[PDB]
Design a protein around this ligand. Structure first.
Ligand code: CL
Ligand code: CL
Lengths: 253, 253
């Protein structure tokens, strides 16, 4: 029933590497929880999906390798990037002298299958990083894998013609409803749209009810307000939607 | 088709709190990505599931509150636990004097729906923590929510009679096959069973093929080897399996 009859597993990595290999010294901490297809009745589709998941989580340079190898190389690269940069920096800050908490680094990459129905595979990537400073950054990314065309769906695969201005107004109208307000200013006073206009984003995901547009920190709100989701039901976009059978499959579910 | 027709969403929290509220000082960093049911055609089932997910991710003290409230209280508690303990400790280490990297703390809690088919809901919790030291700890926990009995499945809900000794031998036999070896000693020389016997764990998950027993770091291998999964197909346990309709539903899928 589901395209490629995909089965998944994950690779977990958790590494603490201290400067100078000394436990009393600052460390970098890496966490990987990577979901990837292990079995398929279409290995072409399996290789395609693995390439996109690896490219999105770790980078294009890692294409062609087994995920276990990718995660190993990625982990070594991160530790060596950290040590070769921060060890001479720490020795310098020490030569002058207490040194700061500017040397404790964290990077987390988690990915899992959010939805897998008929010709659609929704892959969610959670990313977080801290390199000293007041705070770090955290991001949620989505891939809407078209299991026929073996590529992620973009807005111009889901919408016909010139829809940017139209979708912008739908997004504003929906957020106004969610926050029980009747003005752009009322939303703006709550901080929505205070870092910029609520334009449609390529960071979205499909589900049985509609399209959820996912705004990461800074996109439309200040960092401190966190991410924000704006969901548009399919019923409100009927005439704007494309011919891709995934749209019909989502609407039917 | 799926019991309670459940719809899910998540609460994301990312907080950096520095000692003395000073960016130049060490910090604690908390990450929460909590999945919870938002909509159901059986609100009794929805409240039950929310209680278990909150209890498992944050603790029993948080039962009865909305997940947004829970995550807020949990975050404040973590920051205050950190500051009220480590601020006088840091002031003391400073009074003597450079101070260590013993003060950079990290805690991550992520949860998501792994499987939701008919009367079964498999909930995966990913936990990680670092409090200084050579390394931290990371754990993956599973809840096999029985959507009829409104509680997680335990081994004695899935197996009949005295199955511990039997399951132990199945687990050893399966790991031997996975690592292409014919002795307990051959596995032991690879480190498997070097921290203790491979007894059945309550940390398992059901899927269309069988039961995956999830061993966290230290359970049966040294920390450095990471977690290990041992999957037993339903075909190899046919006569040992109980009457719970979820077993039949998994076997049929
Ligand atoms: Cl180290
Ligand atoms: Cl702070």
């Amino acid at each position: 029933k589901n395209t490629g009859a995909l089965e998944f597993d994950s690779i977990q990595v958790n590494e603490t590497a201290h400067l100078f290999g000394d436990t009393a010294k600052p460390a970098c901490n890496l966490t990987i929880n990577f979901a990837y297809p292990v079995k398929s009745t279409d290995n072409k589709l399996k290789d395609s999906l693995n390439s996109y998941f690896i490219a999105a989580c770790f980078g294009e340079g890692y294409i062609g390798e087994k995920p276990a190898q990718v995660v190993k190389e990625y982990t070594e690269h991160y530790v060596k990037e950290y040590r070769t940069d921060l060890e001479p920096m720490y020795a310098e800050d020490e030569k002058n002298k207490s040194i700061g908490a500017w040397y404790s680094y964290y990077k987390g990459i988690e990915s899992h299958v959010q939805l897998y129905y008929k010709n659609l595979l929704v892959y969610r990537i959670n990313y977080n990083e801290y390199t000293g400073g007041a705070h770090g950054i955290y991001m949620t990314t989505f891939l809407n894998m078209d299991l026929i065309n073996l590529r992620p769906l973009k807005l111009d695969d889901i919408f016909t013609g010139d829809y940017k201005e139209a979708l912008t107004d739908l997004l504003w109208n929906q957020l106004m409803a969610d926050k029980k307000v009747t003005t752009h200013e009322a939303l703006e006073d709550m901080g929505y749209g205070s870092t910029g206009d609520i334009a449609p984003t390529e960071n979205f995901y499909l589900d049985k009810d509609g399209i959820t547009f996912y705004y990461n920190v800074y996109d439309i709100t200040p960092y401190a307000m966190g991410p924000v989701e704006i969901k548009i039901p399919y019923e409100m976009m009927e005439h704007m939607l494309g011919s891709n059978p995934i749209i019909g499959e989502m609407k039917s579910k």
